[PDB]
Amino acid sequence: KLSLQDVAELIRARACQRVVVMVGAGISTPSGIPDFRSPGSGLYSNLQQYDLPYPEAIFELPFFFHNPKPFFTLAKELYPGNYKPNVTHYFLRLLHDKGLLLRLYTQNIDGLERVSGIPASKLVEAHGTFASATCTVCQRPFPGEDIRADVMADRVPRCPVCTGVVKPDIVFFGEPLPQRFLLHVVDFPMADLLLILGTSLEVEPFASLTEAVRSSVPRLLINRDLVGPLAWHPRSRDVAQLGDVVHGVESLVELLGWTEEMRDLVQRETGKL
């Protein structure tokens, strides 16, 4: 049974060199963004007078079309600008800078992967993005900045041509995922290590990607708790580092010999933001 230290050695010995990553909302709570399913703090537990008839409506079309203001309220709160990346994002960035990142798959819509300098080409934003928007009536595309001012101003963005509601290219429930998601067909077989960070893996088809790596490939989980197939049916090369994700990441960074470089990179980063 492999250890965190084992995984560090595989990377240090260059035995593992094509890392794919999967992340969820757990990687953004340390930046101040509360998650979905944590008791008390999680958005699916606590939101009275978010004006939502029940919490899951936030990303449901029927409700959006009946009343889009709750969704744009979350947009106002999450607009790349008012939260910062944290050590978990900088670590991913550092994986890219050191030449280890095959691909980063995120369920998050906070944009903090891009804000931290990970290039779009290394990124699969599986649950969509605010980089762009689409009119819900006439399908004209707009750059995401064209709706920044409306959201700040508390207006519902509308199409200059047809007056329809314009919606960021966020994936709602029932909709399929962006075609970039199809990169998994290539990425997962090519990977020689899988990292899973800050997710409960309760959403599909994103969750199912845990199974798409070969059986000789280690799957490393850094998360408050055991989840998915590391919970119900472990493979022999699975590793769980349970606890706070930033602590799990800080241990790994230490076992890898990257502690000064990390804190360096923050500097040129959280400083220059």
Binding site: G174, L177, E202, V203, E204, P205, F206
Partner: peptide, 8 residues
Amino acid sequence: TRSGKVMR
């Protein structure tokens, strides 16, 4: 077809 975003 059956590849939509859903909770399991």
